[PDB]
Symmetry: D2
Amino acid sequence: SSGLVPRGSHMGTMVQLNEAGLFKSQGLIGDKWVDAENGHTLPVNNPATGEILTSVPFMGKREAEKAIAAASQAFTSWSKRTANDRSKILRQWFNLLIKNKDDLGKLIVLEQGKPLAEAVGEIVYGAAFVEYYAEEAKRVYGDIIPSPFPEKRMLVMKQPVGVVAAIAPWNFPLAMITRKVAPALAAGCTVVIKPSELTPLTALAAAELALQAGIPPGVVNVVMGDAKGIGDAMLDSTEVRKITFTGSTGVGKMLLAGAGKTVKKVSLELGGNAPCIVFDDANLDVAVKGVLAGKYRNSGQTCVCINKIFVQDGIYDKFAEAFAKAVSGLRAGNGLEPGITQGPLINETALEKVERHVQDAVSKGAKVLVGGKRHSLGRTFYEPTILGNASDEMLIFREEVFGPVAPLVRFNTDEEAIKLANNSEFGLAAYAFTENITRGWRVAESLEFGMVGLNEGLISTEVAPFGGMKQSGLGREGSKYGLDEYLEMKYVCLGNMAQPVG
Amino acid sequence: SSGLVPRGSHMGTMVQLNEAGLFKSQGLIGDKWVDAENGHTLPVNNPATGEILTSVPFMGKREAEKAIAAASQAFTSWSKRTANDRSKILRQWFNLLIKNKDDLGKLIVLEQGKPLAEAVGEIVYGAAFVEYYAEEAKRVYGDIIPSPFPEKRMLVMKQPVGVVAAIAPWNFPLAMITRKVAPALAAGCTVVIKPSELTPLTALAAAELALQAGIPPGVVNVVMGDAKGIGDAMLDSTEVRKITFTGSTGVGKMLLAGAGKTVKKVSLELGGNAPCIVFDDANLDVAVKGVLAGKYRNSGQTCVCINKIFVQDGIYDKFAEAFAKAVSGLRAGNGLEPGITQGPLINETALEKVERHVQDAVSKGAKVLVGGKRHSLGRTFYEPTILGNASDEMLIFREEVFGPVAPLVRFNTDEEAIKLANNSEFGLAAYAFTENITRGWRVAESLEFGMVGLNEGLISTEVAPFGGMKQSGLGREGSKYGLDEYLEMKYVCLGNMAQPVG
Amino acid sequence: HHHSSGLVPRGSHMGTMVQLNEAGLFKSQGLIGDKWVDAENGHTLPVNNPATGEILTSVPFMGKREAEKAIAAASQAFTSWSKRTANDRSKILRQWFNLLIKNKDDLGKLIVLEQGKPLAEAVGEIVYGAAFVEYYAEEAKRVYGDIIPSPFPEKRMLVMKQPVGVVAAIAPWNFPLAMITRKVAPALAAGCTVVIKPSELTPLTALAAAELALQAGIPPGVVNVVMGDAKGIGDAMLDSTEVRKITFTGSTGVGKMLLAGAGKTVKKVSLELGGNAPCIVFDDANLDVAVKGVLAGKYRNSGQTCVCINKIFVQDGIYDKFAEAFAKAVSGLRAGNGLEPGITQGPLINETALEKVERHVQDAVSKGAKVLVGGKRHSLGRTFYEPTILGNASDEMLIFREEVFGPVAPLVRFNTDEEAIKLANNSEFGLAAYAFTENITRGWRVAESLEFGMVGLNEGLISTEVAPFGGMKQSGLGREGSKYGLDEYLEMKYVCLGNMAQPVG
Amino acid sequence: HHHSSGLVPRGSHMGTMVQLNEAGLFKSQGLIGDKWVDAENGHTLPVNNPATGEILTSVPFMGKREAEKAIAAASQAFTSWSKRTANDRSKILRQWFNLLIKNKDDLGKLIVLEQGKPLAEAVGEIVYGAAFVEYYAEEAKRVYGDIIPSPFPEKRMLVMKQPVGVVAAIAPWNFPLAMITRKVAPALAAGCTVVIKPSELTPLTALAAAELALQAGIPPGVVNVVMGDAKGIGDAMLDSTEVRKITFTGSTGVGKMLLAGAGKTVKKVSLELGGNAPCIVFDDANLDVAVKGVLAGKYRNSGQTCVCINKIFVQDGIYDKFAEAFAKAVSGLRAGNGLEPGITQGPLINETALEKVERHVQDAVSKGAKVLVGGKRHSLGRTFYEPTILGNASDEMLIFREEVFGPVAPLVRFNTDEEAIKLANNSEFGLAAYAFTENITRGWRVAESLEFGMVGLNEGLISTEVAPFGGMKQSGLGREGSKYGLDEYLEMKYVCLGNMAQPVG
């Protein structure tokens, strides 16, 4: 036979991405796209098919040091530009992200697996941080404080912290990059980005578009490979004044510990174990639709995903029945296929953790209402699952499942559910469903979480502060407050000042 | 002979302090003034006389755990009070601090050594933080953010972080306590305070007045003794949600590293090595008066003290001559004696560090213009010193002297002095003296320090944000921004919202 | 000296008047600069107790000349007062706050004596009025300026905020202290000086408050109090170029005239005028919360507040239950002299107020309204009116179209949420409105939809110094209370520094 | 079609007018709702080129009836426009910003044609005017509300901010685009609709801007443009209860009349009126910075700006050096048609403006002023006036007391800093002021002491969209530009939620 024998299943989509200049197989250090110093690489695989998309460089300490030096050299000129000038350049980057959203969405599908509608939604959401901070760059206001000393005048100026090291996870391959890079650049910082080695292609496409937008070389640098060696170079550098990380609690805690020796500013977003409380007076359709969206988006692979649902005694049977019917309409498969609403889990480790949580729950009395097994598609596809009769002794109650498994815990009183929701060291997202004004405000105030969805399952937005309390994080991303993480305050006291004339 | 044989030299002052209820020899845990569990104690000595004032408990891990448990139990009720109620109670504490300022000032003199005028000034300044945050407690504003989703409404609430562990140094025995405790209490937090074992009496007097003001038991707790064991209990506790520290860089870095395992919020104020630039167009009298005040206050024992002075070539001789004449008017002695403007260094370790810096400078070419030796009073009194012809190879240039030694470095251009000022890992305070508007604003913007005095040697105030850049700290104390360190933000997203009617 | 001598007119509550006079809080003169003064011609006006008809005292009947002297004193004092640090003004204003609180029981009795409200409400007014003094003593130190990022590399941009200058403040009779402090406290905090004209019906509390301001260390000329010929005093305030701002609370007609007159010197003007507050009780309201809320929102100060509920729209499904429980609640109110314990309704301020209440009740009854409770003059006589409820009210009635300022509650039945909201928004008033619903979506929707400056949601008592109070549409300009209240007394100044250098590396 | 046919009047710059007419930016009708309209009686007024005397076109001469129809269209459009999300209005306003920038060269030429300024200044005005559209497209999403700590445990307190409603905007001739966008951009961003009345002397740029607003997707009725009988249009704006706010920039006399008329419907009013800017050059000023600064601050738009330097106080020690260098700088200016490259001074708008300039120069010379440069009509004729400097000026001269609005710079010698500051502050104007000093203490002191809404310190060009612009005293009310500019178009609403529960442990 004669004809094209492709190595991958989506060569047409890869060819279009490459024709658009969005497919990259090298890192970015200063004014050059580079390989690792020894030419070593690592494969990036499509989780739905198992096929290699491309190899990317396997970089370490040396490349990270060169990326930090390039960012430090670029900082002087970038930080001295007017806010208006940085704003114009960041808006050009925002426009290019939006212009290329359909192709960028497909690249997210290929390397991370989520359905195309979710991936295009992620480009719109991720790009929104670029627009938001392009506007916020011009709103870094200083202060004039009334002085209690007649001969002194007091000012507060705000200035960029310096070089930022940003480390991102695989579950939102664009939005996790822009959430960190956009405020840093807006403030006048330069960045060294280490995306997840599982999903680096979207970060490299985003950096290509940043260069096309006129972001000078060295302002954005992208390295990947030996995550430990790259992280250690970031921590050991005195030029890196801030580190921002999103990912696992264990890695986050080590970075925070390592940051101590150079007193770096640190912002982290770590594990979440989101409780969702469905009260007796909830609007049933709003609750079912809200929990379906909050739990199963990205096949449960978000740190704001609903991890455990507390359902009040009077609404339990009606909720379990309607929720099972809604979950049964979910469809698993390749994210480039229309009608698909569940993608595969990122890898075999993720699948094994989901199976460990389901087995532990069933061994402790949980009832499988829907799913509870590997999907017929094989690989890392798992059936959307609901576990009834769950309890506080189960692994799924105590730890983040990061998969499409929804456990239901029955409860009697409002106070019982709230105390149970607050009884952990997590504090990222929480949810509540009630039609009552007093109960709704009370539950929102009582929940010890950085974010609360009240009659809402999808809370993500660039305009609001996102982050955790307790062991779920430090600092916030999004909103006017997101920019403060990248600034240093300076109090200036002017002395020998005169009294005004009559 | 017959008559009173006192152990100390200032029994009359101690008797008055005791009669006023301000002399304490026990720690405070919940509703009890306590000894250590084994009755062990440590002496507190008067640095000017060598005499023991009193012994205080030598507490450790167990007492710190009991103080944390008391603060955690008190948090629920204290945090649920209205801001107005906490404000009223904090204002009562402020009024009692001011009513007792003369006696409290004398207690600072006795245990820390500074002149009485400086000690009473410290009570007024330290109490000002209590007043400031009593007012700011009612101004913890939340937000309503315009939602890009027509069916959602977005709010931001701000709530107290929880139990705070506060560790303070010896150089400002009251103000370092109130700078941390006042914002924590105002936000609705409870505190476990560990003052310096060298100067704990003022913290205990302040806590007595907090109880008299109606601050409930357990809201403020004071422990001291084994600083390492107390610090480890603070770091190991999951109830301690925040740690605030002021003191040495080495200890600060260890605490920041230890805080990582429970993801605590951390605010630190560490070492400073303040440069002061005297330009050719400085007003000479303003510069001389400013540098004298900025260098020799507390005998140079402040982390905002001027550590190195860069003097431009054209004004060098005139400045050195007038500055030597001003320094020669300083008078060392016991802080309770009128006319005294220099107290003793806190202990022999501090004196040895000062002597090490002076010897190193003289061995590398520095010229002693005034002082340069131990004062005739002996003990830890050191002569106010000026070292001419100093350079960037000297220990005093590279490290914080924390003593009454002023090195002068000649320079030619503005750019040279600014680059030299910015060439360190310190970033706490810096100073500049110039009459020119363009030069003054340029130097203030260019200096990479958290605070800049422009034609001003005394910049401390409760209304402005104090803290460091680079390795000098994290977070700010004072101003509206000081309260944010003790709060957690919460984004609440309300869904299924209706469109307004016509 | 013999008890038969008549220099002091004998009467009721003489013991209270002697205690007030002993405290230095019973005044019979105005205050201009460093002197307590009579009118230039010695003319006066009597202050009478509305519950007894007895004379308390006379105050001067001043006019144009005295107002000009008060403005000159305030203008001379402005230079020094505005140049003090914010901290210094804050300390002095806190001393005034403390003296108001220390004297609250006597000051509360003085409000009862001249205005008539029950003593519990009058002492509550002192605590609320004094709260504005405390609030702005704290806010004086928080007049922050800005540093704005400059789009020009060679320029730097600042915003400073400075006091506007001399303020003329005109206050009504229904809150004789709080209306004074709501205007004076922010003005003084910002660094302004004031010329205050209290209502000639209730000037004694303003004069007692000014005495305590002097005791607190407020310098002479910073606070001045004049009264008498309101039109002539107002004209002197409007004609003066030194008066840079006017603040007025009162009737819409007088407010509109002052706003028109302010045009010729381009004065800053803040106004709080008539309100006609609708209250919507939805079917899903918590009945006890609605009944308690409407009782408090309507009958406080016998209905003589501009945030008082003027008309109640009740949804069809809850109408009968609400009308029955609301009538039972209103029947517990008790009218009488405010110094007698247990009294919860005082008299209406004067015969004009009583005639207006009777005109509204007669008009409603002639157009089909049903009297469920009250509907007539109280057996005590004078200006006491029975707490009233009128069922079957409609949009053609005078009480629906205009502010009753009396203890009359009309009930309008409605079917849909949209009908009640459109009906609530169909006027030129925009001060307060109220809504009662247990539903989160409905509650937020009604709060957003109501075209009013203030909305009580499941709350009948919304007054506080921490929140911005004022009206939309023809109910006012500007706000009082909150951080925003201080902006009314400040002028912004943009300072642009040029020939600025680039920072060094 | 033959070149001899006269339907289009032949003239100069016909190529530019054809290019503008091709782009859809040369309009001869007003805009009311979804229609471009003539006046109801077909009456018109001519728009003439001030540098050539030629007719550009006619625009309608509208009055009361057309203004009422424009207000009705804006009121009908308000419901839908105000209910859009802030993000949606932001996207549409950014599209308008982009179209203004895309068409800046043609729009700049249209400003030259009808107002006369040099083309470089006119293109600069488009960039500056469009900057307000961008600024408020961004600020629309930053209308933050508040949550205030409640002193009542059972209540929660919020502050919402909502658009005021229909806005009536009246603009002058000296910045034909920027004066429109400074008012329209914040109004639209907040969710208001507008009825704009540009100056009848320069309406073409406003109509071109409105065409581009329609192309950007701004719905019909959100922006409406009427012109003609300014008094009748203004009266319709004032009499309408739907017009909730009026914003005006122009003469003090007209401003005062509008503020007086606004009283009867309690409209929110913002005004920017006459300025008489003093400029103080101290002995320690950097001479080159002062000369360059005063040249730019005085002669920009041939002195026809309300922030223009009207009088210069020069300290005794620097007087001779400043006068000599300033005269040399002014002698380099070149008058002529703004479409000719190299021209830096355009003509005065009309004969009334020229007569006022001649009246100020004659009055100064009759009272002892010395003409150092210019002092007469330019050789080009029409309304071109020679850039002038008058030495030995004094406080008795008309140019010192009143706004010249022309290229005349009077110099007043002074001895002490305090003398110059008191002299600068001795008027009822309070718009812009300037100071030149190298000393940090003197610079900050003069900036704090000057009783003006804007101060340039070592800067002659202070205009920017990011900072608050407006006047103190009789120079205005409210501010334009900056975050504060949007507050003028919003109403605050306090919402108090009651019956609230305590949080759980």
